[PDB]
Amino acid sequence: SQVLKIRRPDDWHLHLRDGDMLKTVVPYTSEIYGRAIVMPNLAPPVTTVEAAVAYRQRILDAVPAGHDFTPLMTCYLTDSLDPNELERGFNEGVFTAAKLYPANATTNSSHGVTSVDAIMPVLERMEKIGMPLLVHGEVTHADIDIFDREARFIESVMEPLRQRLTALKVVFEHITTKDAADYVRDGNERLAATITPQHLMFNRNHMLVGGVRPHLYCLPILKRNIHQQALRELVASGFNRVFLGTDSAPHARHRKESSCGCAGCFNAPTALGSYATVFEEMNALQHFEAFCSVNGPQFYGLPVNDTFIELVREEQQVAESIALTDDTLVPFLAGETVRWSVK
Amino acid sequence: SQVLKIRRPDDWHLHLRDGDMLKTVVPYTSEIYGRAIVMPNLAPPVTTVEAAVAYRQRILDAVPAGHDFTPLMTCYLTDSLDPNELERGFNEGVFTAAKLYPANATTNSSHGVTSVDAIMPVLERMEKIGMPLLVHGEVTHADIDIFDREARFIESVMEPLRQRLTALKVVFEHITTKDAADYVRDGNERLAATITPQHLMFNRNHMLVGGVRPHLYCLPILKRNIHQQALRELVASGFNRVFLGTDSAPHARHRKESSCGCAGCFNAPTALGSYATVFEEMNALQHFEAFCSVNGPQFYGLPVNDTFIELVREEQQVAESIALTDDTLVPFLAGETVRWSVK
Ligand SMILES: O=C1NC(C(=O)O)=C[C@H](C(=O)O)N1
Ligand SMILES: O=C1NC(C(=O)O)=C[C@H](C(=O)O)N1
Ligand SMILES: [Zn+2]
Ligand SMILES: [Zn+2]
Ligand SMILES: [Zn+2]
Ligand SMILES: [Zn+2]
């Protein structure tokens, strides 16, 4: 019976893939979100204006008629990236931001950045022209326990970087730890963060107790419950430099369910309702709209969307699977009941 | 190429399953080990002398001709277990030991234990007759992080138990933490432990960095590197109350590589050479035989084997899979080149 009307949201961290997967997954986004930050970790990665322009058209070709959706493109940073290519892309309205992937931190990140020092001229230009930096904040050294890679990145990479480039605007993407939650809560106006639905709904126990569940396996890895509780307290607080970023990251079923499952939750279909449930459970629905629809635009210096959507507290069942030309796609919370759905 | 001759080993912690799976996996054990402790967790569990006698025979039926293999049977401890039934099985040489799986208040009295306190009559009887207790040492409360479940057991159950029943001999099965390594090391002649090959060879990064690997998913869960190092140090020390227990725990490929993967490594085919590799790496081959062939029999009060086997340091490839009647079995280290092989 409970209806919840909000300003149309945006997704400030999205993986749309390419080809047949792209066709399949964009509508789950374009039917709800006004804009999306579309990450550049294709194979090969989007590291040029030309690439990004063509990719943006592939995205628009796949948007159903009558969806008013704008994909906001990113540059995949690399050690050798020409800062003139990054700036040109920004000035032509192609690149909204640039994305820092530490080499081998996640999917399609082997071409990622090997150090901050290797890309200083690029970072200094971003700082100059006011282009925000999106960070996948994990270290990747083989000796560092997977669950420590986020916290380690803060002391060793993030904090020194922000001390060097005091005017650089940085989004700490998909934060998963109390460490990151306090770092952002205590940061200045040039530091923001996104949080996915899964890192709010679940902790590592959900992925590993009673069976291993690859459909909850994603990066950065789900942490212990005290971390999850931090993140939930952060969004519930009303802190206005956190915003919605799904990190929807789809993989075919048998790439998830194999002897080496790919990391990624396909949560585009079910994310907004999942966020609503978290905010509802935290007695913080008065902060929901801002998380979804205002905080991101404010950080990015963009206008808020001028249309509205409704969520209804009526229990929908999530589909077991979504067809692809080859294999299926298992949505996040496949087969599950959800408390809130879009009207 | 280098040869390691040892007295014929034994496996002090093994799962053989039943029916067709038993028929397939027995030979991997019976060709190498003289004896194995056969765990009782069938469906339904082995909780009677009658059941254990029939199970033993099904095992024996499946032992290839010429193999000198003796299965050592165990009783699954339950709330409803009659202490006279357990004592009769022990007296008759049917039950070598009794196995305690984690308590759970919602468990049917026919299938498990609600609390240790509720099975004191049985624990006091084992203590009286000198019957060893094998302990899966995890507390399974929903609110306890999975990586903490072993350490919490020590504090909450193991120590209080051993302080109550001071003559009870206890094997702390498949230890995975420094917490347990230290505990066992600082214990008395009545406390011992087994360690698996996977818990020596790997830590949780191997299961979760660069993909999720369900074939490394088993209980208790792989822990962070410091724990793996504590276990390696313990076996390498020559400490003589630790011994070989594979915890070989097979599941068909489709049950491992699903949306909810079963816990358990099928390591019977490769465990021995994997332990040899570990002792070599620790510069401790002088303690290899004792671990495999001496320590367990001493603790259990059984004769050391009088026949010998030989491992050779010749590189061999592990099969990618093993045929079942209806699926396949993916072995531990499938498709990998291993260092030590039986001659
Ligand atoms: O698990 C994932 N998978 C992917 C992907 O692109 O497959 C991206 C994110 C991320 O770390 O940003 N997490
Ligand atoms: O991962 C596993 N799976 C099983 C099993 O019986 O499936 C047993 C062991 C254990 O904890 O004893 N570990
Ligand atoms: Zn990322
Ligand atoms: Zn991402
Ligand atoms: Zn066990
Ligand atoms: Zn076991």
Curated annotation (Swiss-Prot), chains A, B:
Stimuli inducing this protein: Induced by pyrimidine limitation.
Residues modified as N6-carboxylysine: 99
Highest rank taxon of the organism: Bacteria
Assigned GO CC terms: cytoplasm; cytosol
Catalysis: reaction(s): (S)-dihydroorotate + H2O = N-carbamoyl-L-aspartate + H(+)
Molecular function per GO: dihydroorotase activity; protein homodimerization activity; zinc ion binding
Major enzyme class: hydrolase
GO BP term, pick one: pyrimidine nucleotide biosynthetic process
Amino-acid positions noted as binding substrate in the UniProt annotation, renumbered to this chain: 15-17, 41, 136, 219, 251, 263
UniProt domain comment: There is an asymmetry between active sites in the dimer, with dihydroorotate bound to the active site of subunit A and N-carbamoyl-L-aspartate bound to the active site of subunit B.
Function: Catalyzes the reversible cyclization of carbamoyl aspartate to dihydroorotate.
Name of protein: Dihydroorotase
Protein source organism: Escherichia coli (strain K12)
Gene that this sequence comes from: pyrC
